[PDB]
């Protein structure tokens, strides 16, 4: 429906592609080219040294860590015939997970989430996958990922990965990401447990700041988990020509995992809402106590002080002949009323 | 025809008629001397600064053969940006804004564009605009504004509007930059008022910018005879600029909402602080007050008439009760 032209930004020349993000520390290319019986695995920084792997009969996995080098991604896209808009979507990290189909390749945008126990923050790293008839290109924002198990399987010939094509490679990477989401959710569960214990025992403002940033983190997780389910659903239902039919059932399995993940999210948010409500209880209880004090004094003293005002009148015909001594009479009156009121408060259990 | 706007002072009719090699620019308050500018084949740009001057806009609309409905739309300033296409002309409603750094108030001005056959009509509330670069381009042959026809001029006007939006976004950006750290370090009712005002300004911004991007999408995706097919990529560029503006507005709104969220967190503890202060003062003074009341009654033959300096003894016992109560307070983790 659209020609899919470039972005045409402002304050930027017409043809330039800009790496949106904040990571520029490291650059590296890692190539693992594997077959039924043999495999090569090497790390370089020379882009040409990975170019001749496009026309390789056996499946290959190219991994460019560090996409701030717009020259490298541009050269790879030009060599592999990748559309410039796809290159922009690779560089543009401020984006949601998505899947796009083309006659020569399939493009996927996913997210990797890390959660440090300290500083209570969620950190996202966009990963890009391009599956071409013989190769799988990966673009990573920085050093560190979750695809180590897939590398182990390739290196030690475990499972059935070496017996299949690049579509199984794409499946393996997507499965690894989905499985890492489970460890992320376990970390979130532990953090909610300790935070809720804190709000039970220590109802302060720091707990509230932590709870609110945690709520924001869950909102972001939902916003990034729903497009993931959309992506995998399209993957095993649109069934693009590049993915073989035999590998389609496998996708379905990991899709189920995604659904499971979403369901877990549906619990966690609810739980955190409850603990926020718990906060109020705690703090309100404290305030409540400070008011009961304020009653069990004022009710004792304000009415009782009133009687003094009745005998603080500067009148002349007040009955003052009293009995015995009248100051003890007022003392008896205050004693009996104070005992009555305090007994009332005690039986009310205040 | 009623005028909703509050600007009812300025009325200037500014005509700019350019050709491939000729130009004529002048401002006058007479309309019968500028109505026949549409007759010439040279593209023309007319700017009417008076919408409160209803007679002149009615006359120019009658002379240009535009339906009275668009005149009513022009008069009604309080509106959202919009676009309509008729077989004789294209009518667009846009908005400019100005932002005051000292007084953080974002104020607006309606603009009406009417692209007719080989000319354009413009309607603006008050003097002071953002289209001076277009006028300079026409004057000095700086760009290709003179070579092309009136659709390029409508493009240039919309581009100037978008440029002004970018400038205002820069101002809101550094406002957010200062305000975020001001709230995170020194929260106070001024910071809350600033953040609420910024939120309302961003509300107005997005409510104006989304209709603008819809208008631009209608401008380039649709293929009306008023604008030539060769002017579509420029409108596409303006549409992409509007996408930029909308995304920036979304980010700013999210940041400000987070600021309000983090501010309103500690409401439940200032109430406890007031609890504590009031209960301390009452608890330590009401018994003292009633001791004074007891020893203030007018009684006859009351016991404590003169028993070894009754006043110092009463004051000492009262102070003993007070210090007991304050020791209890400091023991029970209050103050």
């Amino acid at each position, epitope marked *: 429906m659209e020609e899919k032209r470039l972005s045409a930004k402002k304050g*930027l*020349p017409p043809g*330039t592609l800009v*790496y949106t993000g904040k990571y520029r520390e490291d650059f590296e290319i890692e190539v693992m080219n594997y077959s039924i019986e043999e495999f090569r695995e090497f790390k370089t920084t020379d882009v040409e040294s990975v170019l001749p792997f496009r026309d390789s009969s056996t499946p290959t996995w190219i991994n460019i860590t560090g996409i701030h080098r717009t*020259d490298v991604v*541009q050269r790879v896209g030009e060599f592999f015939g990748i559309h410039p808009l796809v290159l922009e979507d690779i560089l543009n990290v401020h984006q949601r997970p998505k899947v796009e189909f083309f006659e020569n390749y399939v493009f996927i945008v996913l997210k990797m989430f890390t959660y440090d126990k300290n500083l209570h923050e969620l950190e996202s790293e966009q990963v890009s996958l391009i599956l071409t008839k013989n190769c799988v290109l990966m673009f990573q924002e920085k050093i560190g990922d979750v695809f180590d198990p897939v590398r182990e399987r390739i290196r030690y010939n475990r499972g059935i990965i070496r017996k299949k094509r690049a579509d199984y490679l794409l499946y393996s990477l997507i499965d690894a990401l989905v499985d890492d989401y489970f460890v992320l959710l376990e970390k979130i569960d532990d953090e909610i447990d300790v935070l809720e214990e804190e709000v039970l025992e220590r109802p302060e403002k720091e707990t509230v700041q932590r709870t609110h940033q945690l709520k924001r983190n869950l909102v972001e997780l939902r916003k990034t988990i729903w497009p993931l389910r959309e992506v995998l659903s399209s993957l095993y239902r649109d069934v693009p020509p590049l993915i073989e039919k035999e590998t389609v059932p496998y996708f379905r399995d990991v899709y189920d995992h995604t659904i499971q993940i979403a369901d877990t999210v549906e619990t966690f948010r609810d739980i955190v809402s409850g603990l926020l409500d718990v906060y109020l209880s705690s703090v309100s209880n404290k305030t409540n106590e400070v008011m009961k004090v304020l009653t069990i004094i004022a009710t004792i003293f304000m009415p009782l002080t009133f009687i003094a005002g009745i005998y603080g009148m500067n009148f002349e015909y007040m009955p003052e002949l009293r009995w015995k001594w009248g100051y003890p009479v007022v003392l008896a009156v205050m004693g009996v009323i104070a005992v009555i009121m305090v007994v009332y408060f005690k039986k009310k259990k205040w | 025809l009623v005028y909703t706007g509050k600007y009812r002072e300025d009325f200037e009719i500014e005509v700019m008629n350019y050709s491939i090699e000729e130009f004529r620019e002048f401002k006058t308050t007479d309309v019968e001397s500028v109505l026949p500018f549409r007759d010439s084949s040279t593209p023309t740009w007319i700017n009417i600064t008076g919408i409160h001057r209803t007679d002149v806009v009615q006359r120019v609309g009658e002379f240009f053969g535009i339906h009275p409905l668009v005149l009513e739309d022009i008069l009604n300033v309080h509106q959202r940006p919009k676009v309509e296409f008729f077989e004789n002309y294209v009518f667009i409603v846009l908005k400019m804004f100005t932002y005051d750094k000292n007084l953080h108030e974002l104020e607006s001005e309606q603009v009406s564009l009417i692209l007719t056959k080989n000319c354009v009509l413009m309607f603006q509330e008050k003097i002071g605009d953002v289209f001076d670069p277009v006028r300079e381009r026409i004057r000095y042959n700086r760009g290709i504004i003179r070579k092309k026809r009136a659709d390029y001029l409508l493009y240039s006007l919309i581009d100037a509007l978008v440029d002004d939006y970018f400038v205002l*976004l*820069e101002k809101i950006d550094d406002e957010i930059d*200062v305000l975020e750290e001001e709230v995170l370090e020194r929260p106070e009712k001024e910071t809350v008022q600033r953040t609420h005002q910024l939120k309302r300004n961003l509300v107005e911004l997005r409510k104006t910018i989304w209709p603008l991007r819809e208008v631009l999408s209608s401008l380039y995706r649709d293929v009306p005879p008023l604008i030539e097919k060769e002017t579509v990529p420029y409108f596409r560029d303006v549409y992409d600029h509007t996408i930029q503006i909308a995304d*920036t507005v979304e980010t700013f709104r999210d940041i400000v909402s987070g600021l309000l969220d983090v501010y309103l967190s500690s409401v439940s503890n200032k109430t406890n602080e007031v609890m504590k202060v009031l209960t301390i003062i009452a608890t330590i003074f009401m018994p003292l007050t009633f001791i004074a009341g007891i020893y203030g009654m007018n009684f006859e033959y009351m016991p404590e008439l003169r028993w070894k300096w009754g006043y110092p003894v009463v004051l000492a016992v009262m102070g003993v009760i007070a210090v007991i109560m304050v020791v209890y307070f400091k023991k029970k983790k209050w103050l």
Partner: antibody, heavy 126, light 107 residues
Framework: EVQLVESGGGLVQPGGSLRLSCAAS????????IHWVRQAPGKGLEWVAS????????SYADSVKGRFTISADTSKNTAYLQMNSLRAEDTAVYYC???????????????????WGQGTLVTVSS | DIQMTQSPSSLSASVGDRVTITCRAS??????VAWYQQKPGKAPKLLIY???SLYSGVPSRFSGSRSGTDFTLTISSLQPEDFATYYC?????????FGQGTKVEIK
């Protein structure tokens, strides 16, 4: 691995002209912006020109507009600066810098200069 | 155009103390400020970009901060290799301009 080398600077008569060549190795001149910066003897840095080799979109400083020219050759990977009608206040050390783009907000973009050349001296006297 | 006024101009502070340089923009620049360091006789070396982000391969003692339209460079603990001229740079427009510079001396 990345190197920027400036050549061509030297004496020139006032009102003269000369072309400065910035040869770049370790990268392709098309993918990055190339800037010419100036520093007068005992003064501060002053920006002069900017070029995007792929598109050719030039940007000249307000002081040297219409008086300087900047170009880029991808075939030989070199950025050229033709300085015409030089005045006595153009004598300075000229630096060639390579700049990328970084992202701040969806509306605002910035650029930073990673790698600089050694800079060549240009004197306009006598 | 946009002016970037840099203060002070000849700051002097011995080794081991925090040094701050302020840089005020004549116009609103959207955090597109870079800080460079230039020793005499040699080309400048970038230190800060985006007014806060630290470059790759630069010591962490250099820091940059922005408040409104004021951008500050801080050296937490000087070293004998940190005595040079420091320059602002605004990239908010295609017409990018530098500051006057702040030579740092030995007290």
């Amino acid at each position: 691995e990345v190197q920027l080398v400036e050549s061509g600077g030297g004496l020139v008569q006032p009102g003269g002209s000369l072309r400065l060549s910035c040869a770049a190795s370790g990268f392709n001149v098309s993918y990055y912006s190339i800037h010419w910066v100036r520093q007068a003897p005992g003064k501060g840095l002053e920006w002069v020109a900017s070029i995007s080799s792929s598109s050719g979109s030039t940007s000249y400083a307000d002081s040297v507009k219409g008086r300087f020219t900047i170009s880029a050759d991808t075939s030989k990977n070199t950025a050229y600066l033709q300085m015409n009608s030089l005045r006595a206040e153009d004598t300075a050390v000229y630096y060639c810098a390579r700049s990328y783009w970084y992202y701040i907000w969806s509306y605002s973009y910035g650029n930073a200069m990673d790698y600089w050349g050694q800079g060549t001296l240009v004197t306009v006297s006598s | 155009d946009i002016q970037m006024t840099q203060s002070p101009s000849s700051l002097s502070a011995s080794v081991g103390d925090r040094v701050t340089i302020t840089c005020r923009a004549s116009q609103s620049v959207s955090s597109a400020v870079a800080w460079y360091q230039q020793k005499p006789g040699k080309a400048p070396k970038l230190l800060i970009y985006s007014a806060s982000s630290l470059y790759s391969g630069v010591p962490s003692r250099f820091s940059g901060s922005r408040s409104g339209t004021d951008f500050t460079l801080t050296i937490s603990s000087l070293q004998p290799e940190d005595f040079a001229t420091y320059y602002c740079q605004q990239s908010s427009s295609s017409l990018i301009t530098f500051g006057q510079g702040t030579k740092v001396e030995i007290k």
